[PDB]
Write a protein that binds this ligand. Structure first.
Ligand SMILES: CNc1ccccc1C(=O)O[C@H]1[C@@H](O)[C@H](n2cnc3c(N)ncnc32)O[C@@H]1COP(=O)(O)OP(=O)(O)O
Ligand SMILES: [Mg+2]
Ligand SMILES: [Mg+2]
Lengths: 262, 1725
C-alpha cells in the first residue's frame, strides 16, 4: 500500500571502506611468508629485500592490484643468485584480476647497469596456480621487449592472506610464452591455459642489504581514480624517490575538489 | 610531607564561571521600584547623585603636573575627579596601585600617568631619549580594545619617540616587534604564552611596569590567566630583587581589598575605591525580567518589549541596541522598523524635510551595503565585525553626528569604538558558547562595557540603560551593575595546566615551590578571607592558619593528574617535579594536559590521514561539543562526500568535529547556526593544536607523519587542500584562472618550462600572459647542492648548498621565509637530521651553506633524501636524492701502537743531577707512555710523533727533547708552538721555573708584537708561541738567521689542524720542513697530539720514522677514564638545561661524593645559576656544607677579597664558579680553594676550558651547545673542546680512576660515542685559507711561478689527505693526474684573486711577482682583503678622521660579537665622541669598533669586560696603522702619512692630538692639566727643568706617585738629531742625492715603552721622513729601531732646478710630543 512513508537515499562510495582498510596494511609487514620446496628449483635464486617489500605492501590496495618492475644484479662471483635491487612504480591502474601497465618499459641511467628480473604484483586471494592473466601479461611483455629473458624474468605475487602476506614467485615456460602472447581471452579459464605454462622459482627474503624505489618524475603512479588520463601508449620518466600510499591526496584530486565545489 | 589527601578539583569548581553570584542578597539604592507586566517584571533603579566635594578635592589643571608629563596630556585642560586624586600616587610614587571606578570614570589616564613616570625614568638630554632601557606591558581583555589603545597611546606619546604596537599573530621569529616596541599592548592569554616559552633571548626582563586593565576579569573563566601572570611576575621579583610596578584597574565590585593584597598593594597608599556615583554621567537603570518559558512566545514578547521602549525615545534620544550575533543585528533592526510601519510611527524618528534626512538617504546611495541601504534612509543601522571596515566608520560617523536614531550592534562596537548613546538596550543576555557547547549568559565584562556607553558625557544630562533578560537572572545583573557582585577566583579549574607551566619554566621544581607559588594566586587570598566559599571548613582553617596543608593537597592533586598524563614525573616522597618534552609542548602551545595524553597514546609513526584527523577529533578542548538532532541531517549529507573518511558513526561527537574541520578547509558555508559557531571554535584552535602535533612527531623522527602533520597545519591556515593548484595562495590572484588551470590536469611544476605567450595557449587565453608567468616565478623555489665529505666509515659530513630560484617581494613574502630542512633515510620513514632554515629578505639572492652530520653503515645504503619544505607555503618542496653509489669511503684506521709492558722508568734515567732535580720532587717514576718514548726522544735526534690522550703527560715528553738540546750545546734554540694562548700562558709559567729559575736558561713568551718577538727569539733558549704569533716571524726566515738556526721545533696539540684556526698551524710546521731541507742540516721536529686515527699521515707529513711514531689510542690513558654519555630528549635548550639540573647533583653523589668535581656549563650566566642550583638541591636533602671540607672561619681570609654577590654565598657552602666576568684575582682565589680541597665543586664556563690550572676527579659536561650572538643560533661544542674538558678529569697521583659524565641532547649521543671511545680523525682546511699564505710565499720569493705554487702545496698536510680521503676535498679519484688538475685550479684561482686585488703580478700566465700592496700585507700579517680596501679608501687629503674609519672596517675586526642590549650605549657614544659621524647602522661589527677605538682615546674606562674587546682590537691596531703609513707614503702623500704616524702614538697612550702631552705621566689628572694655567708647562721637558724640592708642590701628589712620574721622564725619548746633505755643491737634477741623519740617544735601553693603557709591551719605533711643506709630496721615509747611536741614509731624486725648501721629520709610533722638525735649504744646479 504505502503512500505512508518517506525515506531519502544516502550515498556510500566504494573507496571509503577500502581506504580505511588500507590504513592498517602496515600490520601485515610484520608477518611475511614465502612458499618453499615443491619442485621449485629452477637455476636462479632471487633475493628480495624486506625494506622495499614492506613499503610495496602498504602503498597497495587490498582489492585493486598494483604492480612494480623488478631490477637487480648478481653477487660478485655467483651468477646463479639474483639480488633484487630496485622496484620501479609506473603509471598504472588495475582490478582484482590484473594490472594495466604502459607499453614502455622503465628507462633510466640508474638502471642501465642492472638487468630486468621481471615484475611483482599484489593478489587479493592466495592462489595455488599462477594467474592466466599473469601468464598473458608476462608473455606479451616478453614479445615487445627482448630485454626480458624467459629464464631470467619472474612473476612475484603478494597474496593477501588474513593477518599476513604470502609470497610466491613463478616463471614462464617456453610453452607458456607462446600461449601468453596469443591469448585474447581475459577470463579465469582461458583456452590453452595449462599448468605446463609456468614453473615456480625459489625466493628468499633478506635483511643484509636494502633496495630502492623509482617513481614517475612528474605525476605519481596510482591512476585508479584517474583512469581516463591513463593510456597504454603513455610515455613517462622516473626519479629517485619513494612512492606514496594508494589513497594519498595526490592520487584522488577529484575527491578533494568536488567536495569543495558549493 | 604530612599525610596528603587527593581532592576532586571539578567539585570545587564554580560552574557558572563569570555568572557565579557569591553574594546571596542584594540591596538596591533608594527610590528603586518594580512593576508587574505581561508575564514579565520590570525593575527600575534611579540615577545616583554625585557625592559632594568633601575633602580637599580641586580638579587639577595639567599646568600643575610635572612638565615632562604634560606632553602626554595634549588636548586636556584639567583632570577629572578620580585622576586628580591619583596623580601624586601615579607620577611621584612607585607604589603598586589598584583603582576601582565605574566604567567611564577615566581610569585609563591614571594608567597613562604611571606609564609617563616610567618613561621619565630613562630620559637623556638630547630630547630624544633611551627607549632601550625599559618596557611597559598594557594587558587589555579584548582584541578590539587592544588595537584601539595601540593607536590611542601611539598618538598621545608620539612626541616622546615611543613606539606602541600590537603583537603579531604568530611570531616564533617575526618577534622583531618586542625589541622595537616600548609599550606592548596584549591580551592576558598572549602575555601568558610568551612568558611560558622561557628562553632568555627574551625582552621580558626589561619590563618595569605592568598594567592590568579591567582586572575584574578574575571572576571570569579567563581569570586564572591573570592570576598566572601576576604570580609569575611577583614571585620572580623576589627571585631577582628587581622591582616591577603593578597597576590594576577594576570596576566597582566587592572583594577589592583581596585584589589589592593579591597585587601587593598597600591599602593605605595604593588602594582607591570609587562607587558608581563617580560615573561622569548619571545612569538610570531599567531591568526587564521575562518569566515566559515557551521559546516562541518569549521570542515575540521581548520583540514587543523592545518596541515599547524604543518609542519612549523615538525622536527624543538615540538608542543603541546590543544583540549577541551578527545575524540578529539585521533581523532585530528590521523587526523593529518593519513593525513601526504597521503602526505608522516612523515619521517621529526624522523631521521629514530636515537637514539630516537628506544626508541619510544620499549616503545610502553610495553605501555599498544592501542590508544597510535598506535601513539607512529611515534612521536605522547595524554594526558588526563581519562587514566592511569603512562602512563601520560610516555607521560611526553618522551616529556621532546625531543622524542615526536606532543602531543595532554587538559587543565588538562597545569594546573597540568610543561611541556613546543616550539610551542603550541589551536585547537579551543569552549567548552561545562553543567552548561550553551550550547557550549561556553574557560575561560580566560585556555587560559592564555595553551599559557603560549609556549617556554621552558631552550633551546628555543622564543615561538610560535598559537590560532585558530572564527573570531568574534579575538578581545577578542587579548585583553586577550595583557594586555587589563579588570578584571570586576560578583558578582551581585551570590549576593543573598552570602548575605545569611553572614546572616547565623551572620556577617550580618541587611541591614546596608550588605551595609558595600558589600563595601568590588570587585564589589563595580568597581562601584565607572566605574559606566557606572554597570548600574549607573552620574544622580546617584554624588547624592550618595559613592553609599550608590545604595548598599541599591541591598541589598534590594537580601533580598526580599531570603525572598520570605523562606531562610531569612526580615523586610523592620527595615532592620533586621532573619536566618532560610532552609537558613542555603542552605549556608552550597552550594545550590542556588531557589533550597531550591523548596525543601520546594515539600518535604512531604508521598513522594515516584518516586517523590523524580522528586524533584531532579527540582533543579535550572539544569535550563539551555534542551532536544535536537538528544537525545530524546536514552533517550526514557531508559525511558521504568528505575526502578524508571518518570511521566513527554520526552520533558520536568525534565525527562532528572531523567533518567540521574538513568543511572549513573546503570553504563550505553551512546553515546550522550552532554548526557555524562550532566550526569557528574548532578551527580557531586547530592551528596551535596541529602545530603541537607537528613538534611532537618531528622531534621523534617520524618522517611520514611529520609530512602529513605539517601539511595539515598549512591546509588549515590556507583553507585549501594539496590537490588544489597552489597558485590560489596569492590572494591578489582571483579564483578566475586557478580553476582554469585546475580543470585541465597537468602538474604545476611544468609552467616553469614555458614563457609569457605560451602559458596562455595552454589554458586557452591570450590575455594575461605575463600575469601567470609573474606569480609562477614569485612562488618560492630552492635548488639544492650537496658536497659529501666522509669523516670515517660510519660518519658522513654533508655541506648542503641552498640556492633560491625565485624572486622576493615584500607584498607576498614579507621580511622572511621559513623552511624545514629534513634529511630522511632510504625508506623515507626516519628523520636522521632536521634543522630550522630561515631565508632573510636581505640575503634573498645569495647561496646558503648548511653543514650537518649523518650516520652511515658499511653495507652502504642506496641513497638518503634531503627535503626542504616550506613552513607556511602549500605544495612548496624540493627533495634532492643523495646517492651513495660513487661515495669513496676512507680506509679503516690502522691499529694503534701497542703499549709495551715496559718497566716504570725512574727519574735517574736522565743521569744528570741538574736535570733530575726538576722531577724527583713530584712523582717516583714516569708513566708507561713516557717510558716508551724516552730512548727515542732523549737518546736520539730523529723526528718523533707522540699521539696520546689528554692527560697522558705529553708535556714531559716535549721536555725530553728540550733537555737533550741543552746537552749537545748549552746554547740551544727551541721554539714551542701551542694552538691556544691560554695554553701558552700556562706552559710559560711552568717552564719559566724549570728551565730559567732552576737551570738558569732563558724562557720567553711571544707577545704578538714584532718589535719584541724578534729579540726574545734571539735571546731565548725556549720560545713559547701560538701559530699566528710564529707565522709572522718565520715568513721572513730568508732574511733572519734567528728563525732558521733552530735546534728543536715542538708543536703541541697538533690535532687542532682540523679546527677553525688549523690552516695557520699547518702552514708554519710545513714551512719548518721546507726550511730544514733547504738549510745545511735538518732541524728536529717533535709533535704531540691527542689520539689520531690517521696519525701515520701526520708522521709522514712531519717526516717521522715508523719506529719513532707512537700512535696511542684513548684506551691506554695512564689514569683509567670512565665515560658516561646520558641522552636528553628535550629539544628546547632552556628546558633541557632544567632537566639536567638535578641529574648533575645526582651524578656527583654517585661518582664522586668526596673527591673534587668540575661542572662545565654553556654560558657565564649559567655558572652562577647552576652553582646556586647545586646548593639548594644539596640543601633539600638536608646536607648543606657537605662540599666544604674546611671550617667556615678559615675562609674569610680569602672570602672578603671578592666583589661578587653570590660567589661569597656559594663559597661558604663549598661551591665556587669561574667565568670571564670575574677579575683575574677572583679566579685565582677560587682555583686555590678548589685545589687545596676546601671547596669540592666549581662551575666553569665552556670558554675557560683551555685556561684552568685545576683538575678534578669527576667532570660533568652540562649540555654541549652554546648560543652564538651574531647568527642568533645555537652552536655545537667543537670536538676539540670536549676532548679538553674530559682531560680535566685526571689526578694521576691522587685518584685510582677518572670519571666524566656528558649530558647532551639525544641527537648527539651517538656522535660522541664514535669520537671519544675511538681516536679522532683530523683533516685539513688550508684550501679555504690559501690566499694569505700564497701571498707571503710570493713576497719572500719562495713561489716565483705557477709551477712553484704546486710545489709548495706538496709540502703541506693538506696534500697528504687528498689521497686518503678525496671526497672530503671534492675529488672523484686518487689518480695522480686528478691531483695535478685539482692542485692547479686551486693554484689558478688563488693567484688570480691575489692579482685582482693588485697584490701580485702575473706575466704570460706563468710567472708571478709580488706588488707593493702584497709586500705590506705579508710584512704586517694582514688579510689581502683588508689591504685591498686599504687603497680604495685612502687618498692624499686623509687625516685623523679618515684613518680611523678605514682601519675599523678591516676584516680582522669581523669576529668579535655584538650586543644589542648595548645599542643605546653606542647610540650616545656616537656623540660622546668629539668627532662627527654620518652613517647609522649600529650592529656593524666595524662601526661598533670605530666608536670603540675613539672610546680608548677618550679614556672611558670600565666596560664591564667589553674592556677586553678593546684589548684585542688594540692587538691589531698598530699593524694596521703601519700598513696605511706604508700605503700613503708609497703614493707620495705627506699629510695622511704623518697624521697616521702620530695616530700610532695616539692609540699607544690613549689620547688625541688636541690634549696636552702631559697625560702620559702616571697619576696625572685630566683636570689639573689646566693647573698648568699660564705657568708655562705644556711639554714633558718642562717638568724636569724645575727643582726637586719645588716640583712636588704643584701636582699635589704622593711621594709614592712622583716616582712613577719620574720613571717616565727617565724613559721619555730624549735624543739628539744631526743631519747633513752629502755634497751639497754638486747636485744635478736626476743624479744620486743622499741625506744622512744621525740619531744619538742619551742612555735608555731601560725596559720597553711606558704605556699603561696598552695591553702589549712595545718597543720605541721611529720614522725619518723628508718632505716639502704641505704640498703633500713625501720624498723619503725610513724605519729604524734605535738603541743608542745609529745613522739613517736617505736617497731620492732632484726635481728640475731652482731652490726648493725641504722639511725633515723625526716621528715615533709610541710617545707624543717628541716629533722633531728640522729645516734646511738645497741649491740645485
Ligand atoms: C570624544 N571623547 C574625548 C574628547 C576629547 C578627549 C578625550 C575623549 C575621550 O576619549 O573620552 C575618554 C576620556 O579621554 C575622557 N576623559 C578622561 N579624563 C578626562 C578629563 N580629565 N576631561 C575630559 N575627559 C576625560 O573620558 C572618556 C572615557 O575615559 P576612560 O578611560 O575610558 O574611563 P574607564 O571606563 O574607567 O576606563
Ligand atoms: Mg577602561
Ligand atoms: Mg698537554
Amino acid at each position: 500500500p504505502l503512500g505512508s512513508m518517506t525515506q531519502t537515499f544516502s550515498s556510500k562510495t566504494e573507496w571509503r571502506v577500502r581506504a580505511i582498510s588500507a590504513a592498517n596494511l602496515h600490520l601485515r609487514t610484520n608477518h611475511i611468508y614465502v612458499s618453499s620446496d615443491d619442485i621449485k628449483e629452477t637455476g636462479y635464486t632471487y633475493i628480495l629485500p624486506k625494506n622495499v617489500l614492506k613499503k610495496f605492501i602498504c602503498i597497495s590496495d587490498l582489492r585493486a592490484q598494483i604492480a612494480g618492475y623488478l631490477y637487480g644484479v648478481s653477487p660478485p662471483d655467483n651468477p646463479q643468485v639474483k639480488e633484487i635491487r630496485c622496484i620501479v612504480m609506473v603509471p598504472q591502474w588495475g582490478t582484482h584480476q590484473t594490472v594495466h601497465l604502459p607499453g614502455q618499459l622503465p628507462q633510466h641511467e640508474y638502471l642501465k647497469e642492472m638487468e630486468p628480473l621481471g615484475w611483482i604484483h599484489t593478489q587479493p586471494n592466495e592462489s595455488p596456480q599462477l594467474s592466466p592473466q599473469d601468464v598473458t601479461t608476462h608473455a606479451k611483455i616478453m614479445a615487445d621487449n627482448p630485454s626480458w629473458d624467459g629464464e631470467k624474468t619472474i612473476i612475484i605475487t603478494c597474496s593477501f592472506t588474513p593477518g599476513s602476506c604470502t609470497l610466491t614467485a613463478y616463471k614462464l615456460t617456453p610453452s607458456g610464452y607462446e600461449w601468453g602472447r596469443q591469448n585474447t581471452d581475459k577470463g579465469n579459464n582461458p583456452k590453452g591455459y595449462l599448468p605446463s605454462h609456468y614453473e615456480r622459482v625459489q625466493m628468499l627474503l633478506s635483511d643484509r642489504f636494502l633496495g630502492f624505489f623509482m617513481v614517475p618524475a612528474q605525476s605519481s603512479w596510482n591512476y585508479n581514480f584517474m583512469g581516463v588520463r591513463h593510456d597504454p601508449n603513455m610515455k613517462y620518466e622516473l626519479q629517485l624517490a619513494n612512492p606514496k600510499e594508494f589513497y594519498h591526496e595526490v592520487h584522488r584530486p577529484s575527491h578533494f575538489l568536488n567536495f569543495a565545489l558549493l | 610531607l604530612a599525610p596528603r589527601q587527593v581532592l576532586d578539583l571539578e567539585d570545587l569548581v564554580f560552574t557558572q564561571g563569570s555568572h557565579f553570584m557569591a553574594n546571596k542578597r542584594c540591596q538596591l539604592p533608594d527610590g528603586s521600584f518594580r512593576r508587574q507586566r505581561k508575564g514579565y517584571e520590570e525593575v527600575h533603579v534611579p540615577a545616583l547623585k554625585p557625592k559632594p566635594f568633601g575633602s580637599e578635592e580641586q580638579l587639577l589643571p595639567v599646568e600643575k603636573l610635572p612638565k615632562y608629563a604634560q606632553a602626554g596630556f595634549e588636548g586636556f585642560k584639567t583632570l577629572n575627579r578620580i585622576q586628580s586624586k591619583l596623580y601624586r600616587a601615579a607620577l611621584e610614587t612607585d607604589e603598586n596601585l589598584l583603582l576601582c571606578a565605574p566604567t567611564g570614570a577615566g581610569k585609563t589616564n591614571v594608567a597613562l600617568m604611571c606609564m609617563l613616570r616610567e618613561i621619565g625614568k630613562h630620559i637623556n638630554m638630547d630630547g630624544t631619549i633611551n627607549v632601550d632601557d625599559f618596557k611597559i606591558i598594557y594587558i587589555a581583555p579584548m582584541r578590539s580594545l587592544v588595537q584601539e589603545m595601540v593607536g590611542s597611546f601611539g598618538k598621545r606619546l608620539a612626541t616622546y619617540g615611543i613606539t606602541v604596537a600590537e603583537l603579531t599573530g604568530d611570531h616564533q621569529l617575526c618577534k622583531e616587534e618586542i625589541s622595537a616596541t616600548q609599550i606592548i599592548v596584549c591580551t592576558p592569554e598572549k602575555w601568558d604564552i610568551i612568558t611560558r616559552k622561557g628562553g632568555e633571548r627574551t625582552y621580558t626582563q626589561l619590563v618595569r611596569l605592568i598594567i592590568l586593565d579591567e582586572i575584574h576579569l578574575l571572576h571570569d573563566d579567563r581569570g586564572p590567566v591573570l592570576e598566572a601572570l601576576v604570580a609569575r611576575a611577583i614571585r620572580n621579583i623576589e627571585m631577582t630583587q628587581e622591582d616591577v610596578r603593578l597597576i590594576g584597574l577594576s570596576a566597582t565590585l566587592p572583594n577589592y581589598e583581596d585584589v589589592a593584597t593579591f597585587l601587593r598593594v598597600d591599602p593605605a597608599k595604593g588602594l582607591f575605591y570609587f562607587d558608581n556615583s563617580f560615573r561622569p554621567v548619571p545612569l538610570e537603570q531599567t531591568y526587564v525580567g521575562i518569566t515566559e518559558k515557551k521559546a516562541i512566545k518569549r521570542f515575540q514578547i521581548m520583540n514587543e518589549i523592545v518596541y515599547e521602549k524604543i518609542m519612549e525615545h523615538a525622536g527624543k534620544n538615540q538608542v543603541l541596541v546590543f544583540v549577541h550575533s551578527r545575524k540578529e543585528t539585521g533581523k532585530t533592526a528590521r523587526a523593529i522598523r518593519d513593525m513601526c510601519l504597521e503602526k505608522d510611527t516612523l515619521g517621529l524618528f526624522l523631521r521629514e524635510g530636515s537637514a539630516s534626512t537628506e544626508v541619510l538617504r544620499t549616503e545610502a546611495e553610495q553605501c555599498k551595503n544592501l542590508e544597510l541601504k535598506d535601513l539607512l534612509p529611515y534612521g536605522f543601522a547595524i554594526h558588526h565585525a563581519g562587514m566592511t571596515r569603512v562602512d563601520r566608520t560610516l555607521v560611526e560617523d553618522l551616529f556621532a553626528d546625531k543622524h542615526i536614531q536606532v543602531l543595532v550592534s554587538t559587543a565588538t562596537l562597545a569594546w573597540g569604538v568610543n561611541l556613546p548613546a543616550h539610551t542603550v538596550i541589551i536585547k537579551g543576555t543569552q549567548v552561545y558558547s562553543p567552548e561550553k557547547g551550550r547557550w549561556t549568559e553574557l560575561g560580566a565584562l560585556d555587560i559592564l562595557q555595553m551599559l557603560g556607553r549609556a549617556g554621552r558625557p558631552q550633551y546628555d544630562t543622564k543615561g538610560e540603560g535598559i537590560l532585558i533578560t530572564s527573570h531568574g537572572e534579575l538578581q545577578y545583573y542587579l548585583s553586577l551593575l550595583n557594586q555587589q557582585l563579588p570578584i571570586e577566583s576560578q583558578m582551581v579549574s585551570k590549576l593543573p595546566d598552570m602548575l605545569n607551566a611553572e614546572i616547565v619554566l623551572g620556577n617550580v621544581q618541587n611541591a614546596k615551590d608550588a605551595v609558595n607559588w600558589l600563595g601568590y594566586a588570587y585564589l589563595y587570598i580568597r581562601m584565607l578571607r572566605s574559606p566557606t566559599l572554597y570548600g574549607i571548613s573552620h574544622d580546617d582553617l584554624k588547624g592550618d592558619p595559613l592553609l599550608d596543608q590545604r595548598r599541599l593537597d591541591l598541589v598534590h592533586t594537580a601533580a598526580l593528574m599531570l603525572d598520570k598524563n605523562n606531562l610531569v614525573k612526580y615523586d610523592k616522597k620527595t615532592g620533586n617535579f621532573q619536566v618532560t618534552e610532552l609537558g613542555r609542548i603542552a605549556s608552550h602551545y597552550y594545550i590542556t594536559n588531557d589533550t597531550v595524553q591523548t596525543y601520546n597514546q594515539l600518535l604512531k609513526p604508521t598513522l594515516s590521514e584518516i586517523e590523524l584527523f580522528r586524533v584531532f577529533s579527540l582533543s579535550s578542548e572539544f569535550k563539551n561539543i555534542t551532536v544535536r538532532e537538528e544537525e545530524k541531517l546536514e552533517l550526514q549529507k557531508l559525511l558521504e562526500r568528505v575526502p578524508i573518511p571518518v570511521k566513527e558513526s554520526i552520533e558520536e561527537p568525534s565525527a562532528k568535529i572531523n567533518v567540521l574541520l574538513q568543511a572549513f578547509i573546503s570553504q563550505l558555508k553551512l546553515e546550522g547556526f550552532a554548526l557555524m559557531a562550532d566550526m569557528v571554535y574548532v578551527t580557531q584552535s586547530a592551528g596551535r593544536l596541529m602545530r603541537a602535533i607537528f613538534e611532537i612527531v618531528l622531534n621523534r623522527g617520524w618522517a611520514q607523519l611529520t609530512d602529513k602533520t605539517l601539511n595539515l597545519c598549512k591546509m588549515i591556515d590556507k583553507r585549501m587542500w594539496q590537490s588544489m593548484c597552489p597558485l590560489r595562495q596569492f590572494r591578489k590572484l582571483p579564483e578566475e584562472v586557478v580553476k582554469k588551470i585546475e580543470k585541465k590536469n597537468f602538474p604545476f611544476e611544468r609552467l616553469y618550462d614555458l614563457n609569457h605567450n605560451e602559458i596562455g595557449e595552454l589554458i586557452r587565453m591570450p590575455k594575461m600572459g605575463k600575469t601567470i608567468h609573474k606569480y609562477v616565478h614569485l612562488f618560492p623555489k630552492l635548488e639544492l647542492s650537496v658536497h659529501l665529505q666522509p669523516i670515517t666509515r660510519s660518519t658522513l659530513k654533508v655541506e648542503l648548498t641552498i640556492t633560491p630560484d625565485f624572486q622576493w617581494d615584500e607584498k607576498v613574502h614579507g621580511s622572511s621565509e621559513a623552511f624545514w630542512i629534513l634529511v630522511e633515510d632510504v625508506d623515507s620513514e626516519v628523520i636522521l637530521h632536521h634543522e630550522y632554515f630561515l631565508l632573510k629578505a636581505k640575503y634573498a639572492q645569495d647561496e646558503h651553506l648548511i653543514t650537518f652530520f649523518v650516520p652511515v653503515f658499511e653495507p652502504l645504503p642506496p641513497q638518503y633524501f634531503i627535503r626542504v619544505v616550506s613552513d607556511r607555503w602549500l605544495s612548496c618542496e624540493t627533495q634532492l636524492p643523495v646517492s651513495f653509489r660513487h661515495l669513496i669511503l676512507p680506509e679503516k684506521y690502522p691499529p694503534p701502537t701497542e703499549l709495551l709492558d715496559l718497566q716504570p722508568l725512574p727519574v735517574s734515567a736522565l743521569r744528570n743531577s741538574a736535570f733530575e732535580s726538576l722531577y724527583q720532587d713530584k712523582f717516583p717514576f714516569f708513566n708507561p707512555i713516557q717510558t716508551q718514548v724516552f730512548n727515542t726522544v732523549y737518546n736520539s735526534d730523529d723526528n718523533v710523533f707522540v699521539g696520546a690522550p689528554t692527560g697522558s703527560g705529553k708535556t714531559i715528553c716535549a721536555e725530553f727533547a728540550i733537555l737533550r738540546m741543552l746537552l749537545q750545546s748549552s746554547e740551544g734554540r727551541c721554539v714551542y708552538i701551542t694552538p691556544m694562548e691560554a695554553l701558552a700562558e700556562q706552559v710559560y709559567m711552568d717552564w719559566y721555573e724549570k728551565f730559567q729559575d732552576r737551570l738558569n736558561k732563558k724562557v720567553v713568551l711571544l707577545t704578538g708584537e714584532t718589535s719584541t718577538d724578534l729579540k726574545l727569539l734571539g735571546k731565548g733558549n725556549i720560545i713559547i708561541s701560538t701559530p699566528e704569533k710564529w707565522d709572522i716571524l718565520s715568513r721572513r726566515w730568508k732574511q733572519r738567521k734567528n728563525v732558521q738556526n733552530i735546534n728543536l721545533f715542538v708543536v703541541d696539540e697538533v690535532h687542532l689542524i682540523g679546527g677553525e684556526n688549523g690552516p695557520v698551524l699547518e702552514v708554519i710546521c710545513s714551512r719548518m720542513r721546507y726550511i730544514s731541507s733547504q738549510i745545511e742540516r735538518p732541524i728536529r721536529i717533535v709533535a704531540l697530539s691527542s689520539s689520531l686515527s690517521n696519525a701515520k699521515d701526520v708522521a709522514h707529513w712531519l717526516g717521522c720514522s715508523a719506529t719513532s711514531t707512537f700512535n696511542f689510542h684513548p684506551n691506554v690513558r695512564p689514569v683509567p677514564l670512565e665515560l658516561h654519555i646520558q641522552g636528553f630528549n628535550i629539544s628546547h635548550t632552556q628546558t633541557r638545561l632544567l632537566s639536567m639540573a638535578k641529574p648533575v647533583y645526582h651524578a656527583i653523589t654517585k661518582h664522586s661524593p668526596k673527591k673534587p668535581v668540575i661542572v662545565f656549563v654553556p654560558s657565564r650566566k649559567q655558572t652562577r645559576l647552576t652553582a646556586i642550583d647545586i646548593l639548594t638541591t644539596c640543601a633539600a636533602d638536608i646536607q648543606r656544607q657537605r662540599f666544604l671540607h674546611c671550617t667556615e672561619k678559615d675562609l674569610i681570609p680569602y672570602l672578603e677579597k671578592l666583589s661578587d654577590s653570590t660567589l661569597k654565598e656559594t663559597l661558604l657552602n663549598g661551591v665556587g664558579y669561574l667565568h670571564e666576568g670575574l677579575s683575574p684575582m677572583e679566579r685565582r682565589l677560587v682555583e686555590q680553594l678548589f685545589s687545596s680541597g676546601a671547596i669540592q665543586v666549581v662551575v666553569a664556563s665552556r670558554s675557560l676550558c683551555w685556561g684552568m690550572n685545576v683538575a678534578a676527579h669527576l667532570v660533568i659536561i652540562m649540555d654541549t651547545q652554546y648560543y652564538n650572538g651574531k647568527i642568533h643560533a645555537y652552536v655545537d661544542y667543537p670536538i676539540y673542546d670536549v676532548l679538553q674538558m674530559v682531560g680535566h678529569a685526571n689526578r694521576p697521583l691522587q685518584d685510582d680512576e677518572g670519571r666524566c659524565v656528558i649530558m647532551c641532547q639525544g641527537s648527539k649521543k651517538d656522535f660522541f660515542k664514535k669520537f671519544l671511545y675511538e681516536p679522532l680523525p683530523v683533516e685539513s682546511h688550508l684550501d679555504h685559507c690559501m690566499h694569505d699564505h700564497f701571498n707571503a710565499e710570493i713576497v719572500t720569493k719562495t713561489i716565483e711561478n705557477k709551477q712553484d705554487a704546486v710545489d709548495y702545496l706538496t709540502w703541506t698536510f693538506l696534500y697528504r689527505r687528498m689521497t686518503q680521503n678525496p671526497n672530503y676535498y671534492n675529488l672523484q679519484g686518487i689518480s695522480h693526474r686528478h691531483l695535478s688538475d685539482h692542485l692547479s685550479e686551486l693554484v689558478e684561482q688563488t693567484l688570480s684573486d691575489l692579482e685582482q686585488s693588485k697584490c701580485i703580478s702575473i706575466e704570460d700566465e706563468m710567472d708571478v711577482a709580488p706588488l707593493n700592496l702584497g709586500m705590506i700585507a705579508a710584512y704586517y700579517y694582514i688579510n689581502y682583503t683588508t689591504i685591498e680596501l686599504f687603497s680604495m679608501s685612502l687618498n692624499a687629503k686623509t687625516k685623523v678622521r679618515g684613518l680611523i674609519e678605514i682601519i675599523s672596517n678591516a676584516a680582522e675586526y669581523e669576529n668579535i660579537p655584538i650586543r644589542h642590549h648595548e645599542d643605546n650605549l653606542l647610540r650616545q657614544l656616537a656623540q660622546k665622541v668629539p668627532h662627527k659621524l654620518n652613517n647609522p647602522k649600529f650592529n656593524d661589527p666595524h662601526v661598533k669598533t670605530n666608536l670603540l677605538l675613539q672610546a680608548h682615546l677618550s679614556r672611558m674606562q670600565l666596560s664591564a669586560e667589553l674592556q677586553s674587546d678593546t684589548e684585542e682590537i688594540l692587538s691589531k691596531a698598530i699593524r694596521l696603522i703601519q700598513a696605511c703609513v706604508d700605503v700613503l707614503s708609497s703614493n707620495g702623500w705627506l699629510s695622511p702619512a704623518l697624521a697616521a704616524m702620530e695616530l700610532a702614538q695616539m692609540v699607544t697612550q690613549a689620547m688625541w692630538s688636541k690634549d696636552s702631552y702631559l697625560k702620559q705621566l702616571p697619576h696625572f689628572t685630566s683636570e689639573h692639566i689646566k693647573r698648568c694655567t699660564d705657568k708655562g708647562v705644556e711639554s714633558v721637558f718642562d717638568i724636569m727643568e724645575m727643582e726637586d724640592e719645588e716640583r712636588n708642590a704643584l701636582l699635589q701628589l704622593t711621594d709614592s706617585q712622583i716616582a712613577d712620574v719620574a720613571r717616565f721622564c727617565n724613559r721619555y725619548p730624549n735624543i739628539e738629531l744631526s743631519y747633513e746633505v752629502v755634497d751639497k755643491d754638486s747636485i744635478r737634477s736626476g743624479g744620486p742625492v743622499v741625506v744622512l741623519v744621525q740619531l744619538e740617544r742619551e742612555e735608555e735601553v731601560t725596559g720597553p715603552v711606558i704605556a699603561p693603557l696598552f695591553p702589549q709591551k712595545r718597543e720605541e719605533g721611529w720614522w725619518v721622513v723628508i718632505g716639502d711643506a704641505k704640498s703633500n709630496s713625501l720624498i723619503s721615509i725610513k724605519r729604524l729601531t734605535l738603541q743608542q747611536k745609529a745613522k739613517v741614509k736617505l736617497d731620492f731624486v732632484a726635481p728640475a732646478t731652482g731652490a726648493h725648501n725641504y722639511t725633515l721629520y723625526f716621528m715615533s709610533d709610541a710617545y707624543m710630543g717628541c716629533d722633531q722638525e728640522y729645516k734646511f735649504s738645497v741649491d740645485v744646479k
